Design a protein around this ligand. Structure first.
Ligand SMILES: Nc1ncnc2c1ncn2[C@@H]1O[C@H](COP(=O)(O)OP(=O)(O)OP(=O)(O)O)[C@@H](O)[C@H]1O
Lengths: 147, 512
């Protein structure tokens, strides 16, 4: 007979902690046999991913390569969506205001004009942009993951 | 301004002038285009001879809407297939001169003893210009009606080839046929114009097409376009920074530089190709068209979540996944999406491409639809695209109550001189706004009340009551069955009791 008390007990702890934790981590197990040479040497569209998708098999072969390609494009589009929207608004406001200051300094033309007010507006925009950052604080965690 | 008169003189001018640019900009071309754009394309008449169950018939079609009502095996699908056969040849000639169209299948010929050939005739009227096309096939008859007469359609095809050869971004008529189950050249978008026939209940394919188009649209918004907007992000700022806060001669000197920068920024836009319905412009136009068709929704967008991606529709204050929709809404969604997709691509010059011209054939519109949906589909179809001709066949009486009586045709079967042939009639009343059963009785000639066995006792009890024999023992026995099946409070019993009381009072007065 086989003795499976230890594995059953250890796995029960992982399932219990996974029950009460939103994004609990799991150990990584993999095996790259000699058949990987033509895994890269040589269906319904997937829309849902999960950490248990990698747990179907312990070995690497065939369709895993295909899934990598489908996963990569999913990451790229996620970055592109976050590149647009409100992040572009701060891009337009902060750069133009900074450019407005820089040209004036370069121009050296002639109440001190409105240079102080422009600098104050730039400082306010920079402070708001810094406060708006969330998560990894570098475009959330999508662009950084792709790079 | 006759089309023929403008066409002949433009052809003569083109022949006289060898140079293409000389005739490219001239009064003859402008006159031809101007009179071509105001013409309204619509079919006028059709005749059928020895085709399937139809022996000999001539049908006149309306200019905006026409509804065919009939039973099973009455040739409703025969008429639509005949029109598709006629339009196939015109489409083939438009694509290329001297190209075969669709032939008549051998099994489609009538199986009568004395038949020899089957012929189809059609008439297309464009403002004042008229044309007619006849296609015929003989199975085994010794004498046939010569060959197909395609002379009329070749002139029209050459007209369209001429107009679109010199001036680009022209317009073409729309021909579509939404059939039943059965079963370069703007190909970058993947829409296929080669096939006239299209099938509904293919929501998966349209969903994937929408997702791929959205990804291409998002890709085009970046890269070199992001550079041009960056330049515009400073010229407008300079204009404001030079004319807004310092209003209160060196200060005015910078305005010339700012205007020079604006003109230089205009150089990049000048070196830009025409939109030609690019990926960005197609997406918003399609989405807005669907939103216009269904005003109950606020917006539609594709959301890439932390792990998944899906399309979210908002109505009221609730957000629904696209997959939560029922079968009827999916069918409407793909039908409107395909119509908008074809209309946008076929009219790249018009400011509002939803004002094109064409003919659309729909078979069994009421398939997979709740009765609450059937009562508003016609008004929305006829209001979203106001310049298209529709030919529709239907089975549901609920749809009929929303259609004017001037666009209703009824197919019957009558026998004349020992030969049974089909006939077309018209309703004798106005059926727009009437109740459901009135529409069923007048527009379909069917009994609205079933002939169930439980009904059999009802009329017998009524008849006994009307003959002043309600006190008879037979009536008393029958009342037990009726009152047991229906109940005391049912309105039908209540009116019967009212009649009983009225007759009793009349008998009391007469007796005294
Ligand atoms: N070769 C033929 N000769 C004579 N009659 C034919 C022949 N082929 C078919 N028919 C007739 O065609 C009739 C059915 O025609 P059709 O398909 O137009 O009917 P429909 O009820 O309008 O169709 P649908 O449900 O597709 O709208 C049958 O009743 C049959 O008698």
């Amino acid at each position: 007979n086989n003795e499976l008390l230890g594995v059953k007990k250890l796995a029960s702890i992982y399932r219990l902690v996974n029950k009460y934790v939103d994004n609990a981590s799991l150990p990584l197990m993999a095996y790259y046999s000699i058949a990987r040479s033509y895994i890269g040497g040589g269906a319904k569209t997937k829309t849902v991913w999960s950490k248990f998708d990698v747990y179907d098999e312990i070995e690497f072969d065939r369709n895993d390569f295909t899934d990598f390609f489908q996963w990569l494009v999913f990451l790229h589009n996620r970055a592109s969506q976050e590149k647009l929207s409100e992040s572009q608004t701060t891009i337009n406001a902060l750069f133009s205001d900074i450019q407005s200051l820089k040209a004036t300094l370069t121009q050296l033309s002639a109440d001190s004009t409105v240079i102080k007010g422009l600098e104050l507006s730039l400082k306010e925009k920079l402070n708001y942009m810094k406060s708006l950052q969330s998560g990894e604080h570098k475009f959330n965690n999508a662009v950084s993951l792709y790079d | 301004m006759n089309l023929e008169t403008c066409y002949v003189d433009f052809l003569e001018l083109e022949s006289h002038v060898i140079n293409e640019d000389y005739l490219k900009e001239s009064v003859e071309l402008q006159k031809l285009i101007s009179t071509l754009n105001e013409s309204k394309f619509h079919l006028n008449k059709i005749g059928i001879h020895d085709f399937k169950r139809i022996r000999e018939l001539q049908i006149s079609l309306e200019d905006d809407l026409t509804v065919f009502v009939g039973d099973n095996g009455f040739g409703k699908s025969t008429i639509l297939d005949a029109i598709a056969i006629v339009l196939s040849w015109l489409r083939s000639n438009i694509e290329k001169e001297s190209k075969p169209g669709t032939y008549i299948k051998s099994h489609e010929v009538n199986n009568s003893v004395d038949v020899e050939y089957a012929s189809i005739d059609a008439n297309i009227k464009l403002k004042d210009f008229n044309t007619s096309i006849l296609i015929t096939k003989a199975k085994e008859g010794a004498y046939y009606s010569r060959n197909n007469e395609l002379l009329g359609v070749k002139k029209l095809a050459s007209i369209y080839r001429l107009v679109n050869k010199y001036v680009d971004n022209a317009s073409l008529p729309l021909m579509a046929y939404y059939s039943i189950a059965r079963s370069k050249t703007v190909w970058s978008k993947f829409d296929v114009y080669d096939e006239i026939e299209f099938d509904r209940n293919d929501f998966t394919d349209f969903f994937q097409w929408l997702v791929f188009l959205h990804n291409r649209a998002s890709q085009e918004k970046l890269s070199e376009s992001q550079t041009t907007i960056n330049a515009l992000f400073s010229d407008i700022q300079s204009l404001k920074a030079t004319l807004t806060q310092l209003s209160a001669s060196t200060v005015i000197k910078g305005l010339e530089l700012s205007l020079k920068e604006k003109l230089n920024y205009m150089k990049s836009l000048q070196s830009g190709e025409h939109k030609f319905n690019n990926a960005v412009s197609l997406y918003d136009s399609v989405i807005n068209t669907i939103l216009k068709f269904l005003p109950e929704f606020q917006w539609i967008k594709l959301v890439y979540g932390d792990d998944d991606y899906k399309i979210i529709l908002k109505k009221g204050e609730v957000e629904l996944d696209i997959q939560q929709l029922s079968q009827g809404e999916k069918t409407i969604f793909t039908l409107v999406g395909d119509l908008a997709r074809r209309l946008i691509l076929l009219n790249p010059n018009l400011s509002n491409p939803l004002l094109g011209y064409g003919i659309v054939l729909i078979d069994e519109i009421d398939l997979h639809l709740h009765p609450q949906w059937q009562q508003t589909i016609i008004e929305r179809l006829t209001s979203t695209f106001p310049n298209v001709q529709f030919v529709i066949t239907t089975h549901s009486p609920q749809v009929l109550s929303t259609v004017s009586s001037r666009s209703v045709r009824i197919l019957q079967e009558v026998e004349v001189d020992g030969v049974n042939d089909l006939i077309v009639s018209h309703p004798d009343y106005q059926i727009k706004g009437v109740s459901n059963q009135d529409a069923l009785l007048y527009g379909m000639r069917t009994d609205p009340i079933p002939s169930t066995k439980e009904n059999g006792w009802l009329e017998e009890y009524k008849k006994l009551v009307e003959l002043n024999r309600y006190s008879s023992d037979e009536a008393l026995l029958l009342r037990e069955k009726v009152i047991k099946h229906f109940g005391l409070d049912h309105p039908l019993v209540q009116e019967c009791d009212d009649l009983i009381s009225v007759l009793e009072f009349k008998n009391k007065i007469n007796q005294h």
